[PDB]
Amino acid sequence: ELHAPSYPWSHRGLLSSLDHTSIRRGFQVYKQVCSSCHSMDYVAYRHLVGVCYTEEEAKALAEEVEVQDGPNEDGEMFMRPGKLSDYFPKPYPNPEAARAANNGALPPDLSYIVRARHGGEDYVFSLLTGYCEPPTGVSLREGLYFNPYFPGQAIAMAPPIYNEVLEFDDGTPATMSQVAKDVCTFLRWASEPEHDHRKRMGLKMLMMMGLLLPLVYAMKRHKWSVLKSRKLAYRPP
Amino acid sequence: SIRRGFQVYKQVCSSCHSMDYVAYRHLVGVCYTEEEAKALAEEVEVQDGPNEDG
Amino acid sequence: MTNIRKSHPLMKIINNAFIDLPAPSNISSWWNFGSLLGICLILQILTGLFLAMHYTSDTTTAFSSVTHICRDVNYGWVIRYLHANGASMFFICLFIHVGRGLYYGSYMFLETWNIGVVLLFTVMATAFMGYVLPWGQMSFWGATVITNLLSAIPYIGTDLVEWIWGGFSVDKATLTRFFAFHFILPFIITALAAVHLLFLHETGSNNPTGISSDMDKIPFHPYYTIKDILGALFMMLILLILVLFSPDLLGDPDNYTPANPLNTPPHIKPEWYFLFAYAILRSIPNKLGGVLALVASILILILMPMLHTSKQRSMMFRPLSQCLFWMLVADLITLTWIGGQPVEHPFIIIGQLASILYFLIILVLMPITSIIENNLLKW
Amino acid sequence: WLEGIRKWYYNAAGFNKLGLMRDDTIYEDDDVKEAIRRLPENLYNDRVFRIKRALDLTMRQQILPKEQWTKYEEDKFYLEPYLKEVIRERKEREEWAK
Amino acid sequence: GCVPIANAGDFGGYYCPCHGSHYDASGRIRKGPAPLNLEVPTYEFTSDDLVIVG
Amino acid sequence: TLTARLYSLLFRRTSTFALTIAVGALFFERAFDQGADAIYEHINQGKLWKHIKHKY
Amino acid sequence: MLSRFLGPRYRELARNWIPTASMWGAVGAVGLVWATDWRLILDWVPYINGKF
Amino acid sequence: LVDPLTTVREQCEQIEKCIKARERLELCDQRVSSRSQTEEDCTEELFDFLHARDHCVAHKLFNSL
Amino acid sequence: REFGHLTRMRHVITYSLSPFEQRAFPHYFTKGIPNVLRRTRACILRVAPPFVVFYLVYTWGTQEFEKSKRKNPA
Ligand code: HEM
Numbered sequence A: 001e002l003h004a005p006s007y008p009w010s011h012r013g014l015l016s017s018l019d020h021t022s023i024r025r026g027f028q029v030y031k032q033v034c035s036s037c038h039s040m041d042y043v044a045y046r047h048l049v050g051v052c053y054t055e056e057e058a059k060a061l062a063e064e065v066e067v068q069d070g071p072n073e074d075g076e077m078f079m080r081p082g083k084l085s086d087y088f089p090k091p092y093p094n095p096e097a098a099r100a101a102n103n104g105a106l107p108p109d110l111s112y113i114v115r116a117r118h119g120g121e122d123y124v125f126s127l128l129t130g131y132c133e134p135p136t137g138v139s140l141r142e143g144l145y146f147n148p149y150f151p152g153q154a155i156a157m158a159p160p161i162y163n164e165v166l167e168f169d170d171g172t173p174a175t176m177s178q179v180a181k182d183v184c185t186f187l188r189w190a191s192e193p194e195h196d197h198r199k200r201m202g203l204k205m206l207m208m209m210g211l212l213l214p215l216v217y218a219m220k221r222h223k224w225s226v227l228k229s230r231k232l233a234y235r236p237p
Numbered sequence B: 001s002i003r004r005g006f007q008v009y010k011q012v013c014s015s016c017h018s019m020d021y022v023a024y025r026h027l028v029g030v031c032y033t034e035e036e037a038k039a040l041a042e043e044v045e046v047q048d049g050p051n052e053d054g
Numbered sequence C: 001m002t003n004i005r006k007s008h009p010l011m012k013i014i015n016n017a018f019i020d021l022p023a024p025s026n027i028s029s030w031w032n033f034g035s036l037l038g039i040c041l042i043l044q045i046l047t048g049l050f051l052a053m054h055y056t057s058d059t060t061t062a063f064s065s066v067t068h069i070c071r072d073v074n075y076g077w078v079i080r081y082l083h084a085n086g087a088s089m090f091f092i093c094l095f096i097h098v099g100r101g102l103y104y105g106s107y108m109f110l111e112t113w114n115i116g117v118v119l120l121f122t123v124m125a126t127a128f129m130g131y132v133l134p135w136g137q138m139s140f141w142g143a144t145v146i147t148n149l150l151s152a153i154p155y156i157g158t159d160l161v162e163w164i165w166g167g168f169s170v171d172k173a174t175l176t177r178f179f180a181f182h183f184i185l186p187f188i189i190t191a192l193a194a195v196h197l198l199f200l201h202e203t204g205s206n207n208p209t210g211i212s213s214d215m216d217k218i219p220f221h222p223y224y225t226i227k228d229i230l231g232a233l234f235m236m237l238i239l240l241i242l243v244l245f246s247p248d249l250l251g252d253p254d255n256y257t258p259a260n261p262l263n264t265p266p267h268i269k270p271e272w273y274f275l276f277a278y279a280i281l282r283s284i285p286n287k288l289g290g291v292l293a294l295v296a297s298i299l300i301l302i303l304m305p306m307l308h309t310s311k312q313r314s315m316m317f318r319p320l321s322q323c324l325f326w327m328l329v330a331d332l333i334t335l336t337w338i339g340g341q342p343v344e345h346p347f348i349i350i351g352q353l354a355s356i357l358y359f360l361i362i363l364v365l366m367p368i369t370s371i372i373e374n375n376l377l378k379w
Numbered sequence D: 001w002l003e004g005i006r007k008w009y010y011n012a013a014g015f016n017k018l019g020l021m022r023d024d025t026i027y028e029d030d031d032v033k034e035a036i037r038r039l040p041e042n043l044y045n046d047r048v049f050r051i052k053r054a055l056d057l058t059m060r061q062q063i064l065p066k067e068q069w070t071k072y073e074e075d076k077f078y079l080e081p082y083l084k085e086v087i088r089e090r091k092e093r094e095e096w097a098k
Numbered sequence E: 001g002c003v004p005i006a007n008a009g010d011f012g013g014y015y016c017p018c019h020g021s022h023y024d025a026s027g028r029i030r031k032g033p034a035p036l037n038l039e040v041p042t043y044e045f046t047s048d049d050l051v052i053v054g
Numbered sequence F: 001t002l003t004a005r006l007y008s009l010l011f012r013r014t015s016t017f018a019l020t021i022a023v024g025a026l027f028f029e030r031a032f033d034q035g036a037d038a039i040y041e042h043i044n045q046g047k048l049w050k051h052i053k054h055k056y
Numbered sequence G: 001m002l003s004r005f006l007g008p009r010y011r012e013l014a015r016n017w018i019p020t021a022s023m024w025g026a027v028g029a030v031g032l033v034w035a036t037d038w039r040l041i042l043d044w045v046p047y048i049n050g051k052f
Numbered sequence H: 001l002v003d004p005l006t007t008v009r010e011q012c013e014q015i016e017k018c019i020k021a022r023e024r025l026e027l028c029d030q031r032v033s034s035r036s037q038t039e040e041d042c043t044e045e046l047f048d049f050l051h052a053r054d055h056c057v058a059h060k061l062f063n064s065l
Numbered sequence I: 001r002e003f004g005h006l007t008r009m010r011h012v013i014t015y016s017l018s019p020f021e022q023r024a025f026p027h028y029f030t031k032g033i034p035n036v037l038r039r040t041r042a043c044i045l046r047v048a049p050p051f052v053v054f055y056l057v058y059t060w061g062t063q064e065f066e067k068s069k070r071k072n073p074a
């Protein structure tokens, strides 16, 4: 089938890292577009602190949403404003409610959706910026939408990303390609909350082994030069 | 005595206590026969999982 | 008045093991992998411990606990990916070790070679269970596919599966069972490795030339300790590159999906270090024959010392056998490539050809080549 | 003809480059070990030195200059008679045990 | 052993996604590699429709 | 020669050798961490949550 | 290998050890049936089959 | 507001490889639609055109965002 | 099997040199490069052909898969 092209992400470099302002925009698009139908329960508002939002900002975001907290004195379930430690709200109570809601289809959890799809971000980007009319001959079942990049060539998703879908606080034009770019960077971060630190540790390893290896090699050669300079002589009678 | 004690639990103690680790299946072959255990289990209503509507 | 190095019991054992042990002078770099195995083992025993310290074993908390180790535990992701890719490093070193033993005729050490085969089986089983542990889609479905092979065994076979599954399918019971087995097995591997070193020390290592080197022997400590340190540095370079720069290079992305028994991934492939055998499994339509060929693909190493017909021991002076050996290596690589691709034209016929050629090379081509070989040299 | 193939094989084998003779490269089983023990002292000393020089060269990953290569015609056959006798004695023992 | 998807495919019965085996909406093969038919359990009909499978 | 005086002062005694190694590690940690952090920060200038937190 | 072990006295030794080896195999068969509790065989021995 | 993706889309479609894919797909369209009943579905030529256009647009585009 | 009773060697003399009086990288490129070239020349004719055959088979099989996955004019 059709595989994704290799887009030149700012983080695709060996030592490059994610664009954290793009992560900040990506969280916004997640919260105001796909939070209605997708769950990211593995990540929590705590993780957002210091990577693309500050402490107070993340706290305000948590207070904006309301979550369920354990039973009160009367043994009754109740709502409360979310704090910095709650995980991201799940839009549907049980997965079956999710499947029955949209159309017999379960929106995959986005927490690992970048590392759970062959192609990574390039796929999901091409997924969102890939909707097109069916080619002549296809008789798409009602309630489905055509997306060539999706295996099965028939997404159950509706086109989520149109122009002016939201209002970025930075003021960047929320055009479709832009919005998809930040949502994909955010999704990569969600799937890999180590990408920043991984490259830093790798850089340290490279510039450190670049002197460790020649030195241990020199020690080996120094120790072995006793044998490698051996000069044999055979003197029979 | 086990068979009688189970009834005692069912009618008196079960109003406010529980033996969550014990299922009706355990009673088969110790204090109730298989059909009797079926009848005992069917006298009560238990929560189940989500339907097709969640 | 004496060295406590060569009089204290533990110190005497260590001294005879890797301080004053007479080693061949001309040992090439291919021998370093021996230690590169043990170090890997130690690393695998180490990191796995720190994984078992934040890993539950229930199907409702397996994947979640793994994600917890990756995202929340301080520096936990380093340990997790270090384990996942140190497994691949372990198997790369294992395959290169087996290749070295095959090429230089080290299988003449019968006890050490057989113990090595046992170690290979144990390591493969341990890695299989470990890959089952994180309870991904790949994990669950590969476990089902692999264990369902035992249904092919006549009579007892079905029962055996229900025994290992602890029920009717890979489920809650099997996950914890595999956790316990994956924990215990590496210590058995360590014991067998100690026995292996014992057996090897009773005869001494074999040099690349294949000839006895009792005249040119050097002490192990001043030379091969630093050689092994360099080897460990290189292996750490490769492993750390893998973990730090491209961790999900040798894995499969579908393993990052919670195991759902009601849906299978587009492809069901095992870990890479198993594909070479999986392709052989796929070669024969007869399921029982497939399982038998799967076992024989590894058990052939047992027969390998018997098939040795060449007057010489190694392959240093056997160009024809050298081309045969590299044909075998290319064949194994071909089987590994075939395993990944689905069961379609032309992968099916290529897989059958590769599987046939593997046994043809090991059992027939090599002994006949050695027979021609001796004749070409007056003996 | 065949001897040309044999000479090509001797050249491509590589043990000539190390100064080794044919019999130095043989695997040392029990029969070969007993044959080596049976060797006269003067032959044994040359065998040991040739083997040690070859191991040295392989340790440093080198070969002798082209002039000091054991030629195919000069490749004597010292271990062959002793190995043949040892094999004959072993065959006699096995036949008697039969 | 790849679980086939619901009633769809070439004829409409099944479509096994792993290596493309077809089965009609009876477990019976009609296309693809699909060595044999899908194997049917020891079903037991109760009253109405609550079939006790196995 | 600088190397000769350095050897006589530091490397002759294995105890002074170990002390030299220890202090060298102490200072090398700072030097290397500073250098590596500076390089990584320079390569990815303007992208980490330290060149942009000032905007919030 | 097989050239050496194919002998008159070698087959004679095989014949000598045939009874011990064969009824060692019988020992193994009975032990396997017992430990496994092989019902297929144990249904025919008179007293033991009463267990099932 | 205009999409930079859209802007780069026609520029990438103005490519010889994309051009060839265009009339391939168009001919397939006539073949499929003209016939009363056919399962031969022009997804293959659509996929070729998409692969060409998307490999083109991958190099571009990202330096406009 | 310890040093002292491994074998019996006579009339051999070996001369060595302290590691502190000889270079640890003696002509690492003056004779390193020609030695490497000889080593690879004396082994490539036996190593390469199997892997080159595998590469041909790989590319042929992959393109066979690709152009067997297309549509057949019918
Ligand atoms: C658990 C993994 C293993 C460990 C830790 C291990 C350990 C070792 C070590 C340290 C050596 C000495 C270094 C060397 O010669 O390479 C060695 C030698 C050897 N091993 Fe292994 N080994 C392992 C697996 C195997 C396997 C799978 C085989 C093959 C069946 C094998 C066969 C041999 C042989 C034949 C030797 C002697 C090599 C020679 O003399 O040239 N080993 N082993």
Ligand code: HEM
Pocket: C041, C044, C045, C046, C047, C048, C049, C050, C051, C052, C055, C066, C080, C083, C084, C087, C090, C123, C126, C127, C130, C131, C132, C133, C134, C182, C183, C186, C187, C189, C251
């Ligand atoms: C013989 C050496 C070992 C090998 C080859 C090995 C291999 C593996 C593999 C392949 C995995 C799956 C990695 C993945 O999720 O992708 C794994 C997981 C695991 N192993 Fe091991 N292992 C070894 C030793 C150990 C030991 C000794 C322990 C216990 C101390 C251990 C504990 C674990 C745990 C807890 C996991 C689950 C965590 C995870 O999968 O990331 N392992 N192992």
Ligand code: FES
Pocket: E001, E002, E016, E017, E018, E019, E020, E021, E033, E034
């Ligand atoms: S598993 Fe059903 S066809 Fe491949």
